[PDB]
Amino acid sequence: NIVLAYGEWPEYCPTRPDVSVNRFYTLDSKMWQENSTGWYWKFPDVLNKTGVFGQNAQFHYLYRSGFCLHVQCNASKFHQGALLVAVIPEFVIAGRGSNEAPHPGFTTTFPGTTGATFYDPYVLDSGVPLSQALIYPHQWINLRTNNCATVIVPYINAVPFDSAINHSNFGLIVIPVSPLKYSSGATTAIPITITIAPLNSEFGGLR
Amino acid sequence: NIVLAYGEWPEYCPTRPDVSVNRFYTLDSKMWQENSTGWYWKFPDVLNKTGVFGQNAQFHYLYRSGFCLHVQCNASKFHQGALLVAVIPEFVIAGRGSNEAPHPGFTTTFPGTTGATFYDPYVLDSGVPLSQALIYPHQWINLRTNNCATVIVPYINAVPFDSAINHSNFGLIVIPVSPLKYSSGATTAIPITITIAPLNSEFGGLR
Amino acid sequence: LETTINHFFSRSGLVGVVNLTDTGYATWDIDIMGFVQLRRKCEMFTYMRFNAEFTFVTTTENGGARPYMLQYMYVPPGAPKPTGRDAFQWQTATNPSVFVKLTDPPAQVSVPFMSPASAYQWFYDGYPTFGQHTTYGLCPNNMMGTFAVRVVSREASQLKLQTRVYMKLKHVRAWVPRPIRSQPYLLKNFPNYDSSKITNSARDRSSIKQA
Amino acid sequence: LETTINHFFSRSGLVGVVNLTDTGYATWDIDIMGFVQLRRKCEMFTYMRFNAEFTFVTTTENGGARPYMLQYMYVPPGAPKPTGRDAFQWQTATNPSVFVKLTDPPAQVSVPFMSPASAYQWFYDGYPTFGQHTTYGLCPNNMMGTFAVRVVSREASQLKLQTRVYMKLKHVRAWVPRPIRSQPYLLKNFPNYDSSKITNSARDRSSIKQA
Amino acid sequence: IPAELRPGTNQFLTTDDGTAAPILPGFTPTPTIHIPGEVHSLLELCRVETILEVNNTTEATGLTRLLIPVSSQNKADELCAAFMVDPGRIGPWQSTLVGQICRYYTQWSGSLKVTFMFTGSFMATGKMLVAYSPPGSAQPANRETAMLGTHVIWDFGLQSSVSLVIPWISNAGVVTLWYQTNYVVPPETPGEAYIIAMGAAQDNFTLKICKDTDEVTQQ
Amino acid sequence: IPAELRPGTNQFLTTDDGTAAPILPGFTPTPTIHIPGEVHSLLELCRVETILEVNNTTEATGLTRLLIPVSSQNKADELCAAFMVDPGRIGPWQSTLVGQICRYYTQWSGSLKVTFMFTGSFMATGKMLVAYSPPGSAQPANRETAMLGTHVIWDFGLQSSVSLVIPWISNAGVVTLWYQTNYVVPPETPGEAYIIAMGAAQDNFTLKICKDTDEVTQQ
Amino acid sequence: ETAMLGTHVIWDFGLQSSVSLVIPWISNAGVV
């Protein structure tokens, strides 16, 4: 069923919009081939410059909202392999150099509506081993039994209001733990689609 | 009559076998001649590889049981001399060398069902004088008056469960304090027999 | 018991060796991620909150000396640091000082919690352009001050001193967990790793059978 | 009164003399069976349970000196011991240290009870193969740590020091008795005895009459 | 009033409780708020299940060392995988979390559990025999002498994730996975699946004397 | 508040009560269990009977020095054995236990008792006259002047173990064993028996100032 | 030893002078 993040319902204690921004969004359906290696998105950057919510976070500079996700991959009963859906707070990536000090830059660290690609999966591109990576709220999508995952995440930040262009509250990761296998005579690409819905937005500031 | 060890009834607070191992055992009847010098056994090593109890301490590696002894020498009224039956906890023997460091080895320190023989009696083969050796639970067998001794020993160890092949809880000693004397025209060998019965065994572990 | 999070931090260890020559003074920055014993134990958790308390230990080279009135100072975040040994930043009133001889038992001084946000942050993901007061992942809500050791004399000290700093933590409360670091980091203030040679986590064996 | 078992142990006596040269450090093992006054009084009983407390006393040869910041350390059982005078085992957080000058009054430090079993054991009869963590009668439930005295300086101490260790016992509870030792033992950790020449217990006299 | 000074006047014991004088009197800390996911004791880290490495063989590199291979070609009675149950000691238990925070804290005792789950197709069906021997012996040789121990017959068709409770390790014990039957697949479905491992610790898992660990670097 | 410092600031008195700072704060000792045979005070060692040496003669070597010889050949009126009643002073009382733990504890007072028991055949029968003189004199000469003291007529046939209570020794006194009658044995039974000795202390035995003892070695 | 593990009765000359034994359920061997 659903799985909360750390056991907390998202609520709020500034303007308060309603059901016009309670509508579901739908990002682009990716393609998970035989040798792909993982994606990440870094909410709430990917809801900028899009829709009604984009015109309330681009022109306001205070922000608070908890999300509600729905990850769903569609595949028949002759494919196998399991994904991994985890929600990491404060997701910091680092540059892969060694020395000077080659930073990631900008075009990787804020991907926007197109998700990025992990370079090295085994260490989560941040120096943290994947074997220990189930402390976070996780949910197995396992293509023999179930194909839906429903995580609800409340607002986790120290300061009660932050900006929505500079900062980034958390990130969503998707990793193929078992590689996908199929006998010949089927499709190659199992799509992966995401659904995002803001629960309690509460904006502040003007222009 | 009976004499307990330190005033404590043997009881228990894992598997728990019953009356099949409440049967009496009987070790081999020794021979106490005119110039013999003492024996010892080191329970609960001598009940290994024998009987029903042997097949529950060889294949389990946790152990707790308190014993109940019955030492009995048979002799007519024309023989004289007194034995000594004592139950020493934590009976440690040492090598008789001087220097390097000649240890006893193995074939003496774990005698098994055949009891061993003391080399030097006066100092208990451990650097302790026999004159002070009645702090322990003792019982005089004195061949003019009585010829039976009944000691009951509870489980005396710090850790509440130990193994039953490495460790050894206590030892039983038999020493001739007065040497045996008889006029000619009688037997030479007064036999000495022992009876051992486990009271509350409680085993643990598998294979 | 002893596995609670207050006891897990409350041993005090070395942080930094601060030595001076006569320049005549030796400054130092507060940075608890100095060594590697404590950085791996404090990126365990994301948000922390704790009062520190320090202890300075002075040893002259060759060990022990006649007394001198060396002072310890403290600068709160948001104030200018000293430049020379006799400048007028050693006589302000906002900087609390500690006057302690050599031959006396060591000095000890506490520091309260010193951040505008309600917790520290060991992981920031953003840019400080219109932020709190290249630049990826550096927040100004983490600096805690300096110390600026100085000997007091009119001239000609010539002591060739050496100090140490021991740090205890107190009343520490943590928040949301994170997995531990397993790639030996290169820089001091970034999570970088030598990606040409990624090390493993378990030592290898012969095959998958024969445990 | 004064014959109870708490008062029978509670005098504090010498244990070991630990002296250093400049190597620059002098390590030592905790072993209460050092001398023969205390080994004969503690193999009286089989199982014991007691908190120790130590006291170090420093005397330079020729007696008394200018101060130096010598440190005392402690290693719990199950940790690696120091090797050189400047290695990185002197900066860990698990090893509690004690910084004490020469000219100050002596140092004193307690040690709690440090065994996995619920009592000490001065007599073990078995083999440690699949035991607790040739080899006859040696259990690893008896070691209590080290101390590893070290002087603090950058170089060139040249003091030629000498320390002592006094040991008191506290709250000692005993268990099952044993008779006293009466053959003067040869090795340190075994009950051996020179069996070629067994000594007597009573001095002889002329005959059995004439008391 | 009169007073004396005992031994222990001038010292610095490094495990202390005496507060110093605060350097900023009258300062007000900023008041806290409710941040979710707050940890009281770190014993609530080693109750959360982490992925145990098994296939630490030289040949396997990358992500494919979190995975025990199962192959259709293998016939009845071949050992699938085996690993010793010891947290902290250098082996398979090092990549998990319980094997990390018992590299602190010298002595331990408790009850670790082991969980498996399967990543095959929906059509495939076989069996496995999860076995466990007590620490007094080595691994079994034949399939009979692991059936006489403590087995759990695990199935692919009905269940998809079985658990196991190892009682009372201390400061070895060998779990193996016998192959009861050859893998059965219908035509045009690949015959190579993968069984990943899990690992955790239960509620009565305790720790003792603090100690620093063995990293590789020093700065 | 003001305070002064009296004489006795910096000293180390070696018979102390002041606790130090514990080097491990928050440590938990392991909880004890019930181990039987627990000693509160060591006065319950010197109430347990231990075998007293008597025959410390040069000729007797080995185990046969715990034993007083009695011989059939000896005729009426020959002294059998004698030993001074002094614990601690070097003599017969050294191999026992009361003679050990009064080599500590300089001064003592109490009431030692002496017990005998016999190791002959079942057929033999005679008598003994256990005598005791007060410490003002030496041992008696003739059998009459030990009968006028404090005697206990002991028998082999009826009893087999008699006791005796010496009142109030302090920090000598001589017990002898007169032979009332020649040993009587029926034919073909050996005429050499052995009387072993015992020794203990009763309930009102007290001790005083602590002191270390005289061993032989030093390491 | 392998007769002690069966069904034994330790018989004495001094105390008793006549002991019995009950063999259960023979039919149409067994060795004492």
Side-chain angles (χ1 to χ4, degrees):
Chain A
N1 300 118
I2 67 171
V3 171
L4 280 79
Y6 307 102
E8 182 70 25
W9 282 101
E11 54 87 18
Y12 56 93
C13 65
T15 184
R16 293 182 294 172
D18 280 329
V19 188
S20 69
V21 302
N22 202 2
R23 61 186 296 273
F24 296 95
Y25 294 95
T26 297
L27 267 64
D28 292 333
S29 65
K30 292 288 188 180
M31 295 297 171
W32 164 44
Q33 294 177 356
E34 290 184 354
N35 58 2
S36 181
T37 187
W39 304 269
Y40 64 99
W41 274 275
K42 281 191 180 180
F43 294 156
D45 198 6
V46 309
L47 269 76
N48 297 117
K49 62 176 72 175
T50 294
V52 181
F53 183 81
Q55 298 296 319
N56 290 322
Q58 191 71 41
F59 291 108
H60 292 175
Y61 71 102
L62 271 74
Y63 175 73
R64 167 180 281 179
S65 180
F67 288 94
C68 176
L69 304 179
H70 193 73
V71 176
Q72 181 178 3
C73 62
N74 295 113
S76 67
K77 297 180 178 66
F78 289 170
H79 297 90
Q80 66 184 358
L83 298 173
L84 175 66
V85 175
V87 178
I88 293 174
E90 300 291 326
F91 186 70
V92 175
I93 57 171
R96 290 185 293 112
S98 68
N99 198 358
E100 66 178 0
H103 297 286
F106 178 73
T107 60
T108 300
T109 184
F110 276 164
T113 64
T114 300
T117 303
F118 282 103
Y119 295 93
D120 321 77
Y122 181 73
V123 295
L124 285 174
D125 207 1
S126 176
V128 168
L130 190 147
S131 301
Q132 299 168 358
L134 274 74
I135 311 166
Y136 300 112
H138 67 282
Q139 185 65 38
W140 291 96
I141 292 172
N142 192 357
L143 285 174
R144 62 169 292 161
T145 298
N146 50 0
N147 53 5
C148 61
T150 305
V151 182
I152 296 170
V153 179
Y155 180 70
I156 304 168
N157 197 0
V159 182
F161 291 106
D162 55 350
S163 66
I165 303 100
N166 302 117
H167 202 196
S168 294
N169 294 318
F170 61 92
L172 176 68
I173 58 170
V174 173
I175 302 167
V177 173
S178 174
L180 182 138
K181 299 292 290 297
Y182 58 91
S183 65
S184 68
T187 61
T188 67
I190 304 297
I192 293 172
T193 181
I194 306 171
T195 299
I196 294 98
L199 290 173
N200 290 320
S201 64
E202 186 173 0
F203 296 97
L206 292 173
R207 189 168 294 275
Chain B
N1 300 117
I2 67 171
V3 171
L4 280 79
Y6 307 102
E8 182 70 25
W9 282 101
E11 54 87 18
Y12 56 93
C13 64
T15 184
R16 293 182 294 172
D18 280 329
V19 188
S20 69
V21 302
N22 201 2
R23 61 186 296 273
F24 296 95
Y25 294 95
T26 297
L27 267 64
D28 292 333
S29 65
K30 292 288 188 180
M31 295 297 171
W32 164 44
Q33 294 177 356
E34 290 184 354
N35 58 2
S36 181
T37 187
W39 304 269
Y40 64 99
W41 274 275
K42 281 191 180 180
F43 294 156
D45 198 6
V46 309
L47 269 76
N48 297 117
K49 62 176 72 175
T50 294
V52 181
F53 183 81
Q55 298 296 319
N56 290 322
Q58 191 71 41
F59 291 108
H60 292 175
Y61 71 101
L62 271 74
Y63 175 73
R64 167 180 281 179
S65 180
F67 288 94
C68 176
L69 304 179
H70 193 73
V71 176
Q72 181 178 3
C73 62
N74 295 113
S76 67
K77 297 180 178 66
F78 289 170
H79 297 90
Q80 66 184 358
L83 298 173
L84 175 66
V85 175
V87 178
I88 293 174
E90 300 291 326
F91 186 70
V92 175
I93 57 171
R96 290 185 293 112
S98 68
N99 198 358
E100 66 178 0
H103 297 286
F106 178 73
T107 60
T108 300
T109 184
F110 276 164
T113 64
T114 300
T117 303
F118 281 103
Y119 295 93
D120 321 77
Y122 181 73
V123 295
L124 285 174
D125 207 1
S126 176
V128 168
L130 190 147
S131 301
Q132 299 168 358
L134 274 74
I135 311 166
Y136 300 112
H138 67 282
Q139 185 64 38
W140 291 96
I141 292 172
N142 192 357
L143 285 174
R144 62 169 292 161
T145 298
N146 50 0
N147 53 5
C148 61
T150 305
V151 182
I152 296 170
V153 179
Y155 180 70
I156 304 168
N157 197 0
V159 182
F161 291 106
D162 55 350
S163 66
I165 303 100
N166 302 117
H167 202 196
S168 294
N169 294 318
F170 61 92
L172 176 68
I173 58 170
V174 173
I175 302 167
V177 173
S178 174
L180 182 138
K181 299 292 290 297
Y182 58 91
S183 65
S184 68
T187 61
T188 67
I190 304 297
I192 293 172
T193 181
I194 306 171
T195 299
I196 294 98
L199 290 173
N200 290 320
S201 64
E202 186 173 0
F203 296 97
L206 292 173
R207 189 168 294 275
Chain C
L1 205 146
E2 68 177 358
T3 63
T4 191
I5 204 62
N6 196 1
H7 178 271
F8 182 68
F9 288 157
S10 176
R11 284 90 166 90
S12 63
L14 182 64
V15 170
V17 178
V18 178
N19 48 3
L20 66 98
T21 300
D22 196 358
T23 61
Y25 72 102
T27 184
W28 177 59
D29 299 331
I30 298 169
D31 46 354
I32 73 167
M33 306 303 173
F35 287 170
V36 304
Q37 296 291 328
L38 198 144
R39 182 174 173 178
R40 187 176 180 270
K41 284 168 67 175
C42 292
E43 290 181 354
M44 186 75 73
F45 300 98
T46 297
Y47 303 103
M48 296 175 71
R49 181 179 175 87
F50 59 95
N51 293 322
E53 62 183 3
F54 293 96
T55 295
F56 300 100
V57 170
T58 47
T59 60
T60 307
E61 284 292 330
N62 298 321
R66 292 178 295 274
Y68 294 97
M69 292 291 292
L70 62 91
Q71 68 173 357
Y72 296 101
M73 204 178 71
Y74 176 74
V75 175
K81 294 184 290 294
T83 63
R85 70 170 291 163
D86 292 329
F88 65 96
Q89 285 80 14
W90 301 99
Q91 283 82 14
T92 64
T94 66
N95 304 116
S97 63
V98 173
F99 286 94
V100 163
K101 297 181 181 179
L102 270 303
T103 187
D104 286 332
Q108 184 180 2
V109 54
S110 175
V111 170
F113 184 69
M114 293 298 290
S115 179
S118 69
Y120 288 157
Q121 287 175 351
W122 304 111
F123 292 109
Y124 191 81
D125 191 10
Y127 290 158
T129 171
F130 186 67
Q132 289 292 322
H133 185 272
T134 62
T135 61
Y136 183 74
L138 276 74
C139 184
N141 297 324
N142 294 323
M143 292 298 170
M144 297 173 72
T146 53
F147 278 94
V149 179
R150 183 174 73 86
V151 64
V152 172
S153 180
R154 294 179 69 247
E155 72 267 16
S157 298
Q158 297 178 357
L159 298 180
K160 194 174 73 174
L161 198 64
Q162 179 174 0
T163 63
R164 294 185 182 184
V165 172
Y166 286 105
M167 184 188 292
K168 194 196 289 183
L169 306 181
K170 287 174 69 67
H171 294 171
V172 49
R173 297 167 64 92
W175 277 277
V176 294
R178 283 180 62 89
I180 58 99
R181 187 72 185 271
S182 175
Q183 300 299 312
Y185 43 80
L186 300 173
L187 296 176
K188 192 174 79 69
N189 305 117
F190 294 101
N192 290 116
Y193 59 93
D194 195 356
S195 176
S196 67
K197 295 174 69 67
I198 291 172
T199 189
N200 287 319
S201 66
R203 294 278 80 81
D204 298 333
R205 66 182 185 181
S206 67
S207 66
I208 197 167
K209 304 175 180 68
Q210 295 177 356
Chain D
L1 205 146
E2 68 177 358
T3 63
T4 191
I5 204 62
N6 196 1
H7 178 271
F8 182 68
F9 288 157
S10 176
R11 284 90 166 90
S12 63
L14 182 64
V15 170
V17 178
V18 178
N19 48 3
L20 66 98
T21 300
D22 196 358
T23 61
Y25 72 102
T27 184
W28 177 59
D29 299 331
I30 298 169
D31 46 354
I32 73 167
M33 306 303 173
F35 287 170
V36 304
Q37 296 291 328
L38 198 144
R39 182 174 173 178
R40 187 176 180 270
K41 284 168 67 175
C42 292
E43 290 181 354
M44 186 75 73
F45 300 98
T46 297
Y47 303 103
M48 296 175 71
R49 181 179 175 87
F50 59 95
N51 293 322
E53 62 183 3
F54 293 96
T55 295
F56 300 100
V57 170
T58 47
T59 60
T60 307
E61 284 292 330
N62 298 321
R66 292 178 295 274
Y68 294 97
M69 292 291 292
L70 62 91
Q71 68 173 357
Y72 296 101
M73 204 178 71
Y74 176 74
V75 175
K81 294 184 290 294
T83 63
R85 70 170 291 163
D86 292 329
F88 65 96
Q89 285 80 14
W90 301 99
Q91 283 82 14
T92 64
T94 66
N95 304 116
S97 63
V98 173
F99 286 94
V100 163
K101 297 181 181 179
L102 270 303
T103 187
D104 286 332
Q108 184 180 2
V109 54
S110 175
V111 170
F113 184 69
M114 293 298 290
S115 179
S118 69
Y120 288 157
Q121 287 175 351
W122 304 111
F123 292 109
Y124 191 81
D125 191 10
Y127 290 158
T129 171
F130 186 67
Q132 289 292 322
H133 185 272
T134 62
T135 61
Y136 183 74
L138 276 74
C139 184
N141 297 324
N142 294 323
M143 292 298 170
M144 297 173 72
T146 53
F147 278 94
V149 179
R150 183 174 73 86
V151 64
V152 172
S153 180
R154 294 179 69 247
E155 72 267 16
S157 298
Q158 297 178 357
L159 298 180
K160 194 174 73 174
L161 198 64
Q162 179 174 0
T163 63
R164 294 185 182 184
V165 172
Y166 286 105
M167 184 188 292
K168 194 196 289 183
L169 306 181
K170 287 174 69 67
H171 294 171
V172 49
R173 297 167 64 92
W175 277 277
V176 294
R178 283 180 62 89
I180 58 99
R181 187 72 185 271
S182 175
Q183 300 299 312
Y185 43 80
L186 300 173
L187 296 176
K188 192 174 79 69
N189 305 117
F190 294 101
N192 290 116
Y193 59 94
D194 195 356
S195 176
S196 67
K197 295 174 69 67
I198 291 172
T199 189
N200 287 319
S201 66
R203 294 278 80 81
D204 298 333
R205 66 183 185 181
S206 67
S207 66
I208 197 167
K209 304 176 180 68
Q210 295 177 356
Chain E
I1 61 171
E4 296 180 353
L5 296 179
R6 293 290 90 196
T9 68
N10 298 321
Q11 58 182 355
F12 173 69
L13 199 142
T14 317
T15 303
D16 197 358
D17 57 354
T19 66
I23 204 172
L24 288 172
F27 187 80
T28 63
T30 62
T32 186
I33 58 170
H34 181 70
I35 292 97
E38 181 177 359
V39 173
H40 291 287
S41 68
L42 62 86
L43 195 63
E44 291 181 355
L45 295 182
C46 62
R47 194 172 290 111
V48 180
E49 295 173 350
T50 59
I51 293 170
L52 176 63
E53 283 184 355
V54 176
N55 193 4
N56 289 337
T57 189
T58 65
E59 152 52 3
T61 54
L63 277 173
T64 67
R65 69 191 301 166
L66 303 170
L67 277 65
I68 295 172
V70 175
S71 178
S72 64
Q73 295 85 0
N74 289 337
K75 290 182 292 297
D77 289 345
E78 293 177 350
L79 192 148
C80 183
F83 60 95
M84 289 186 182
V85 181
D86 48 351
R89 292 180 187 269
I90 297 169
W93 281 100
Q94 191 171 2
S95 72
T96 179
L97 187 140
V98 177
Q100 284 292 325
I101 56 100
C102 72
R103 297 294 295 274
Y104 306 150
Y105 293 110
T106 298
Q107 296 178 358
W108 61 86
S109 295
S111 297
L112 278 76
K113 76 173 184 177
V114 171
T115 304
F116 293 98
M117 65 181 288
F118 179 65
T119 316
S121 70
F122 187 72
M123 290 290 106
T125 297
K127 288 181 177 66
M128 294 297 173
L129 192 148
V130 175
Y132 170 71
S133 66
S137 176
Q139 66 176 357
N142 290 319
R143 200 263 300 161
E144 291 89 4
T145 182
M147 185 180 70
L148 300 175
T150 305
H151 61 275
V152 172
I153 296 298
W154 170 49
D155 193 0
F156 296 106
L158 301 175
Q159 288 181 354
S160 180
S161 67
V162 75
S163 65
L164 184 63
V165 177
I166 293 98
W168 194 257
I169 58 100
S170 296
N171 51 3
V174 176
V175 50
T176 65
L177 188 147
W178 291 95
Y179 295 94
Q180 184 64 319
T181 299
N182 63 347
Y183 196 71
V184 175
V185 289
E188 291 176 351
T189 300
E192 290 85 3
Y194 291 106
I195 297 173
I196 61 172
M198 306 296 284
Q202 287 182 355
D203 292 330
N204 51 4
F205 183 74
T206 63
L207 296 175
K208 206 183 287 184
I209 299 168
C210 296
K211 186 176 77 73
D212 288 330
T213 185
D214 294 329
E215 70 274 13
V216 292
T217 184
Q218 182 65 42
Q219 186 179 3
Chain F
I1 61 171
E4 296 180 353
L5 296 179
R6 293 290 90 196
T9 68
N10 297 321
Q11 58 182 355
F12 173 69
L13 199 142
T14 317
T15 303
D16 197 358
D17 57 354
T19 66
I23 204 172
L24 288 172
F27 187 80
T28 63
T30 62
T32 186
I33 58 170
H34 181 70
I35 292 97
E38 181 177 359
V39 173
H40 291 287
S41 68
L42 62 86
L43 195 63
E44 291 181 355
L45 295 182
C46 62
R47 194 171 290 111
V48 180
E49 295 173 350
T50 59
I51 293 170
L52 176 63
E53 283 184 355
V54 176
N55 193 4
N56 289 337
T57 189
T58 65
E59 152 52 3
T61 54
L63 277 172
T64 67
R65 69 191 301 166
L66 303 170
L67 277 65
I68 295 172
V70 175
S71 178
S72 64
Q73 295 85 0
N74 289 337
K75 290 182 292 297
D77 289 345
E78 293 177 350
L79 192 148
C80 183
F83 60 95
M84 289 186 182
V85 181
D86 48 351
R89 292 180 187 269
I90 297 169
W93 281 100
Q94 191 171 2
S95 72
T96 179
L97 187 140
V98 177
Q100 284 292 325
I101 56 100
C102 72
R103 297 294 295 274
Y104 306 150
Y105 293 110
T106 298
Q107 296 178 358
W108 61 86
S109 295
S111 297
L112 278 76
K113 76 173 184 177
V114 171
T115 304
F116 293 98
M117 65 181 288
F118 179 65
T119 316
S121 70
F122 187 72
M123 290 290 106
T125 297
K127 288 181 177 66
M128 294 297 173
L129 192 148
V130 175
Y132 170 71
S133 66
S137 176
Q139 66 176 357
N142 290 319
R143 200 263 300 161
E144 291 89 4
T145 182
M147 185 180 70
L148 300 175
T150 305
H151 61 275
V152 172
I153 296 298
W154 170 49
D155 193 0
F156 296 106
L158 301 175
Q159 288 181 354
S160 180
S161 67
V162 75
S163 65
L164 184 63
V165 177
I166 293 98
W168 194 257
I169 58 100
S170 296
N171 51 3
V174 176
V175 50
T176 65
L177 188 147
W178 291 95
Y179 295 94
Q180 184 64 319
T181 299
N182 63 347
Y183 196 71
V184 175
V185 289
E188 291 176 351
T189 300
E192 290 85 3
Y194 291 106
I195 297 173
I196 61 172
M198 306 296 284
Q202 287 182 355
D203 292 330
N204 51 4
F205 183 74
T206 63
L207 296 175
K208 206 183 287 184
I209 299 168
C210 296
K211 186 176 77 73
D212 288 330
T213 185
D214 294 329
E215 70 274 13
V216 292
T217 184
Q218 182 65 42
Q219 186 179 3
Chain G
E1 291 89 4
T2 182
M4 185 180 70
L5 300 175
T7 305
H8 61 275
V9 173
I10 296 298
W11 170 49
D12 193 0
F13 296 106
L15 301 175
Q16 288 181 354
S17 180
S18 67
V19 75
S20 65
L21 184 63
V22 177
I23 293 98
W25 194 257
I26 58 100
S27 296
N28 51 3
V31 176
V32 50

